[PDB]
Structure 1
Amino acid sequence: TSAVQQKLAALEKSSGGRLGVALIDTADNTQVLYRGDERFPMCSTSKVMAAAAVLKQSETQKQLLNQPVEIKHADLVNYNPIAEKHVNGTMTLAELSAAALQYSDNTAMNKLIAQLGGPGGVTAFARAIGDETFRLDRTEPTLNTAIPGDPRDTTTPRAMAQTLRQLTLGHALGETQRAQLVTWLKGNTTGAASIRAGLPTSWTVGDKTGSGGYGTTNDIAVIWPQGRAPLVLVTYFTQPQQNAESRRDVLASAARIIAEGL
C-alpha cells in the first residue's frame, strides 16, 4: 500500500469506525483511495447531486431557478433553518438550492427532489452525467438512516470524487451552472470543522457536509491549494453503534494526512 494508506488505516483503527477516502489531484490526475470502492451512506452530501440536477434542468427551462415554490407547514421536516421562515409563503428553486447546500436544510432538499420527480430523478441525473454508482432512494430525513449493509442512498468515494470533479471542474453542467454550483459550495456555512480543518488555511475550499445514523460523518470538497491545480476530496466515515456521535475530527485528520502526502 502507499505511506498514506498506512496512515489512513491507522487513523481508521484509532477511530473505531469505517473510513472511505478518495482524492483526485487534477494537477496530474493522481488519486489516493482508501476503501474507495465500498459503499457509504451519503447523507447530506447527496444534496450536491440534487442541486446539480436542478441546475441542469435550468439549462433548458431558462427561468426555472426563479420559479416560486410553496412551503407548507406539512413540508417541514427535522432540520429547516431556512424553509421554516417561509412557511405559508414561497421560495424559489435558486433559494432552495442555496439553502440545501449552504445551510443543509432538509425541507429545501425535499423540494429539489420533488422538482426532479422523486429520488429516482436524482439518480437519473447521476446516470446522465456518467455516474453509474450513485443511488438516491429516499427523501429527507430517512435517507440518513445509514444502516450498515443497506445500499439505499449510498455511493462509493471513488464515484463521488469523479462526479464532484465533473460537476465543479468538468463539463457535466453548462458554464454558468458550473460556476453557480462552485459559488454555492464556496459559501457553505457548515464546513469549518471537517475537511477544511485539516488543510492549510490559505487554501480555498468549497464543500458539502453530511451526517446521519451510526455516527455517520461525511464531507465532499473541491479545493484550490495555493498556487496549484485543484483537488477533489471525499471523506466518508461511519461507525458500529447506531447512536454513535459525530466525528468531524476524523475527516479533518484524514484531510491532513492527504495534504501531507502531496
Structure 2
Amino acid sequence: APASFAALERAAGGRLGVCAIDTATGRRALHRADERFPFCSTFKAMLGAAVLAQSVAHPGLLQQRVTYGRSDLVNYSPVTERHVDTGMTVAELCAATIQYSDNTAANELMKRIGGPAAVTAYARSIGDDTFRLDRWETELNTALPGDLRDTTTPAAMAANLRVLVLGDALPPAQRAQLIEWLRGNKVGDKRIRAGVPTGWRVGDKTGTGDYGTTNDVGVLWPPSRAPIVLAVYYTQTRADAKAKDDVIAAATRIASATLA
C-alpha cells in the first residue's frame, strides 16, 4: 500500500489534497493543503452550521416548515422525494442534507437562508476567507479543472471543522447538534470511516462530483487521545473518471499513521 500522500497520488493518478490536524499538539499532516478543490457535497457541513448560526438569533428557524414541489426535486434527494406532500422542517432538511447528502434539502435550506452568498458570508464570519459557494445543486458539482467556483482548500475546511466542532464558533447547543448530524452520516462507510480503526468515532461529510471528484471531511475521535481533524479532497483528469472511495480510505490511514 502507498505509504505517503505523494505516493498515493502517484498510484491513483489525479490530484489529492489533505489537511490533518492533531488537536493535542497542533502537528499537521499535509499534501496540497493550500490548493483549491471542488468541494461538492462537503459544503453541506458548512450549510448546516450556517443554519444553526442563524437559529441563534431566531430560535424558531429550526421549527419552520418548508414546502417544495415535484419540480423542486433535483437528482440525489432520497429523503426529500418522500415528503413532497407534507414538506419538511428546517431541522429535518439539515439532517437529510448532512446524513443522507440530500440535494433538494440543501437547495431548500439555501432558499430559506439567503442562497450561496449566505453560506459564503457565514464562512467569512468564522474566519474562512477561502471558501466560496457560487452555485446550487447539482450544478455546483461540475468540478471543472481551472474553475474556482464552489471550491475551498483542505486547510481552510479543516480549520472550519476545528472551530465548529471543537471550538466555540457555535454556542454549545448548536455545536452539539452539528456533531450529532456529522456523526450520523449514513453514506460515508467506504471513505474516512474505512481508514480508521473501528474504535475511533467519526463525524464527517462526504462529497462526490464530476471529474471523478471524491471528498470526505470530518473529525476523528480516537478512544484514548485528542481528536484529529481531517479534510480530504481528490479530483481527476478525465470528466468521466470514476470516484475512488479507496483513495480516501488510504489517505485516512496515512494521516492517522503520521499523527500516531
TM-score by length of 2: 0.97
Q: Which amino acid aligns with 1:97?
A: C
RMSD: 1.0
Q: Where does residue 151 of structure 1 map in the other structure?
A: 148
Deviation string 1:73-114 (CA, Å, 9 cap, x unpaired) is 111001110000111321000000000000000000001211
**Runs of 5+ consecutive residues of structure 2 not aligned to the other structure:** none
Q: Within 5 Å, which residues of 2 pair with 1:1-262?
A: 7-261=4-258, 262=260
Q: Does the 8 Å CA contact 1:119/1:137 hold for their aligned counterparts?
A: yes
Distance (Å, rounded) in 1 between the aligned partners of 2:171 and 2:149: 29
**Take 2:113 and 2:9, find their aligned partners in 1: how far apart are those partners?**
37
Per-residue displacement from partner, 1:1-44 (whole Å, max 9, x unpaired)?
xxx9x711011011011000001111111111100000000000
The letter of the residue matching 2:145 is P
Describe the SS at the equivalent of 2:114: coil
**Does the 8 A contact of 1:72 with 1:89 survive in 2?**
no
| Corresponding residue SS for 2:4 | helix
Unpaired segments ≥5 residues, structure 1: none
Where 2:218 maps in the other structure, the secondary structure is strand
In the aligned structure 2, how far is the partner of 1:8 from the partner of 1:118?
A: 35
Which aligned runs of 4 or more in structure 1 are off by greater than 4 angstroms?
A: none
Cα deviation, 1:153-189, whole Å, max 9, x if unaligned, reads: 0000000000011111101111100100000100110
Count of matched residue positions in the alignment of Structure 1 and Structure 2: 258
Q: What CA distance in whole angstroms lies between the structure 1 residues aligned with 2:257 and 2:167?
A: 26
TM-score (norm 1): 0.97
Structure 1: distance between partners of 2:184 and 2:85: 27
**Is 1:110–1:140's contact at 8 Å kept on the other side of the alignment?**
yes
Q: CA deviation at 1:191?
A: 1.1
